[PDB]
Amino acid sequence: MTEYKLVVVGAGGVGKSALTIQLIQNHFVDEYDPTIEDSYRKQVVIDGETCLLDILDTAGHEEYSAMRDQYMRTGEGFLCVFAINNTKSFEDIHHYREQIKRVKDSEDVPMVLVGNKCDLPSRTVDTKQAQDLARSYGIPFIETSAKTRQGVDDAFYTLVREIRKHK
Ligand SMILES: COc1cccc(-c2cccc3c2O[C@H](CNC(=O)c2ccc(OCCN(C)C)cc2)CO3)n1
Ligand SMILES: Nc1nc2c(ncn2[C@@H]2O[C@H](COP(=O)(O)OP(=O)(O)NP(=O)(O)O)[C@@H](O)[C@H]2O)c(=O)[nH]1
Ligand SMILES: [Mg+2]
């Protein structure tokens, strides 16, 4: 079956691990254990093609490393995640897109913008703002909650569909 290498990126605390663990294990993690680098694997069927998702879950709180750039170079597509209750994480998205475009050395990298924590009442980033940012990058936007499971499959499966279009 076909293999897709997906990297989940974004600011500390936005829910990159919670999203991934919700996808793999059908489990919400309540505790906040910061990530350095963790990898996961899942077989799924998307649009009738059976495929193997290799998912790399990154750190938020991370300076420069040559190691960070190796795994971003091998990654075929990226979930750029922010939290809808944290405007700074949304502003940081543009930094992640630049970091990616630099290491891949391309304008046209498969990406999906993910607004996580949509279950929380303390919304500070508007759906319309995030849609406009996504439209400006020519990429999809998906609102998710690792807690309710809303959008989780959609986020990963949409990224795979983006990788297919690109090749
Ligand atoms: C066995 O394959 C798996 C399993 C789970 C996740 C991933 C995965 C997902 C997203 C991005 C990834 C991934 O692993 C890739 C392979 N793993 C690596 O650890 C890796 C090995 C060598 C690298 O250098 C690249 C070229 N040259 C120096 C050898 C770089 C990385 C790294 O990027 N791959
Ligand atoms: N209410 C709510 N909480 C969430 C959601 N997603 C993650 N969280 C919470 O946010 C905290 C951070 O989750 P985590 O997955 O650790 O975020 P992260 O981006 O992996 N952090 P890091 O980059 O430091 O590894 C956790 O306590 C978790 O319960 C969500 O959709 N809703
Ligand atoms: Mg994490």
Author numbering: 1 to 167
Please give sentences taken from the publication describing this entry.
Here, we employ the intracellular antibody to identify a compound from a chemical fragment library that binds to RAS proteins adjacent to the effector binding region. High-resolution crystal structures show the binding of this compound to mutant RAS, and this structural information facilitates hit to lead development. Our structure-based approach has produced compounds that bind to mutant KRAS with sub-μM affinity that interfere with RAS-effector PPI and endogenous RAS-dependent signalling in human cancer cells, and show a correlation between in vitro binding and potency in the cells. Although, various RAS inhibitors have been described in literature,24–32,47,48, in this paper we describe an approach for the development of RAS-effector inhibitors by combining different elements i.e. (i) the hit identification via a method of intracellular antibody fragment competition; (ii) structure-based design via crystal structures (KRASQ61HGPPNHP) and NMR (waterLOGSY and CPMG); (iii) identification of clear structure-activity relationship (SAR) for the development of potent compounds against KRAS and (iv) the proof of concept in mechanistic and phenotypic cell assays.
Crystal soaking of KRASQ61H with Abd-5 showed the new pyridine ring leading to the side of the switch I region of KRAS. This compound forces D54 to rotate to allow the third ring to be accommodated in a pocket formed by S39, Y40, D54, I55 and L56. No H-bond interactions were identified between Abd-5 and the protein, and the only interactions identified were van der Waals contacts to K5, L6, V7, S39, Y40, R41, D54, I55, L56, G70, Y71 and T74. No interactions were observed from the RHS of the molecule. Analysis of crystals soaked with Abd-5 indicated that exploration around the pyridine ring in positions 3 to 5 could gain extra interactions in the KRAS switch I region. An important feature in Abd-5 and Abd-6 was the lack of interactions between KRASQ61H and the benzamide derivative (Abd-5) or the tetrahydropyran-4-carboxamide (Abd-6), substituted from the original furan group in Abd-2. The protein-binding capabilities of the most potent of this series of compounds (Abd-5, Abd-6 and Abd-7) was confirmed in an orthogonal assay (waterLOGSY) using KRASG12V-GppNHp. The values of 220, 38 and 51 nM were found, respectively, for compounds Abd-5, Abd-6 and Abd-7. Compounds Abd-5 and Abd-6 have an effect on the viability (with Abd-5 showing a greater effect on DLD-1 viability); but even at 20 μM and after 72 h, there are surviving cells following incubation with either compound.
